[PDB]
């Protein structure tokens, strides 16, 4: 549901995710690095299923962050694909791909894969 | 076909993979890196479906290579997971995971993922 996803979330590394889910399936917000002052904010955009199933099934969603803002440019982008599971302890469980811009020759090691779990802290 | 996996395969990067498929599912061989060279060779071991479905599906298989030999140790290991399709143009289509041994701090970016297609040409 949109309300359920809207809010502030943190993951196990200490990074901050602030998102707003719109009625049309859109996701907009900011992602912040683990601790590290204020200028560590990056724009994020994504999409979620605004009409999930009844059942105790998660809501699929995903978003992307291009690691460039007015202070830094890491020439990379990460996309998180996962499910939002609501309840008293709501969580967003994801798998992510981080791709860096490389030359033709290092393209073979341009992508890292990992997983993050986010816990909701504010609405 | 079943023991159609046995042979020498090459991927788009120029690495060579030489394997023997045992009747019961084992995969054993050598994986050699760039240039060909002398011991640019590493041991590989894996497993495959020795009784694949009788529908035109490919044969599932997978293998691992730890990047250490008597000359180099890159403190990493790669696993390739995929399927074999035989015929006129036999290929092994894979996706792989390369994990490096890191300290906890770098564990978040310890694994790279990619894909490779091997042919006997």
């Amino acid at each position: 549901a949109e309300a359920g996803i809207t809010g502030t979330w943190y993951n196990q590394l200490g990074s901050t995710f602030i998102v707003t889910a719109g009625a049309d399936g859109a996701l907009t917000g900011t992602y912040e690095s683990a601790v590290g002052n204020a200028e560590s904010r990056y724009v994020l955009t994504g999409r979620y299923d605004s009409a999930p199933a009844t059942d105790g099934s998660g809501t699929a969603l995903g978003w992307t962050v291009a690691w460039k803002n007015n202070y830094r440019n890491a020439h990379s982008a990460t996309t998180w694909s996962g499910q939002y599971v609501g309840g008293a302890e709501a969580r967003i469980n994801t798998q992510w791909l981080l791709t860096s811009g490389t030359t033709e020759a290092n393209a073979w090691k341009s992508t890292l894969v990992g997983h993050d779990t986010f816990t909701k802290v504010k609405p | 076909a079943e023991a159609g996996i046995t042979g020498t395969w090459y991927n788009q990067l120029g690495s060579t993979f030489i394997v023997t498929a045992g009747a019961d599912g084992a995969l054993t061989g050598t994986y050699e890196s760039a240039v060909g060279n002398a011991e640019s060779r590493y041991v590989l071991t894996g497993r495959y479906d020795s009784a694949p479905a009788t529908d035109g599906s490919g044969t599932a298989l997978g293998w691992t290579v730890a990047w250490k030999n008597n000359y180099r140790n890159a403190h990493s290991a790669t696993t390739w997971s995929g399927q074999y399709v035989g015929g006129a143009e036999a290929r092994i289509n894979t996706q792989w995971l390369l994990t490096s041994g890191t300290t906890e701090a770098n564990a978040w970016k310890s694994t790279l993922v990619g894909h490779d297609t091997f042919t006997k040409v």
Partner: peptide
């Protein structure tokens, strides 16, 4: 890394 292409 030995998994990648040559460093030529």
């Amino acid at each position: 890394h030995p998994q990648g292409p040559p460093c030529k």
